[PDB]
Amino acid sequence: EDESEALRQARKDAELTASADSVRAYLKQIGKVALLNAEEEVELAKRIEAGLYATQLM
DNA sequence: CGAACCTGGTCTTGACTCCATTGCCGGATTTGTATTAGACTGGCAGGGTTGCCCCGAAGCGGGCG
């Protein structure tokens, strides 16, 4: 079905596999963080420039 | 009988030639680095074949605390 932790346990146990091919390992690694939009990019760029000026001032 | 001679070299002096050998210098080519603002967001991809043997690891029946 879609619940009762059978499919959930299957997805969890299939997440903790070997994946001996290094390309598949790196792709499963990078398919983790959430993608962003233009507002998130604006926010992160402003935070980056603020942090850079703050550490240069320090 | 002596005497010129003539010619092996042995060697030097002086002028001449000629080509390496750096040295700038001006320009040519060669090589390296930086920068491009619309938006773009998790692979293609190729095969699976023997026989025999040894041995080491995974997993399952079976009793035990």
Curated annotation (Swiss-Prot):
Transmembrane segments: none annotated. Residues 20-54 are annotated as: Sigma-70 factor domain-1. It is found in: Cytoplasm. The sigma-70 factor domain-2 mediates sequence-specific interaction with the -10 element in promoter DNA, and plays an important role in melting the double-stranded DNA and the formation of the transcription bubble. The sigma-70 factor domain-2 mediates interaction with the RNA polymerase subunits RpoB and RpoC. Sigma factors are initiation factors that promote the attachment of RNA polymerase to specific initiation sites and are then released. This sigma factor is the primary sigma factor during exponential growth. Interacts transiently with the RNA polymerase catalytic core formed by RpoA, RpoB, RpoC and RpoZ (2 alpha, 1 beta, 1 beta' and 1 omega subunit) to form the RNA polymerase holoenzyme that can initiate transcription. Belongs to the sigma-70 factor family. RpoD/SigA subfamily. This is RNA polymerase sigma factor SigA. It comes from Mycobacterium tuberculosis (strain CDC 1551 / Oshkosh). The gene is sigA. The chain holds residues 206 to 263 of 528 of the full protein.
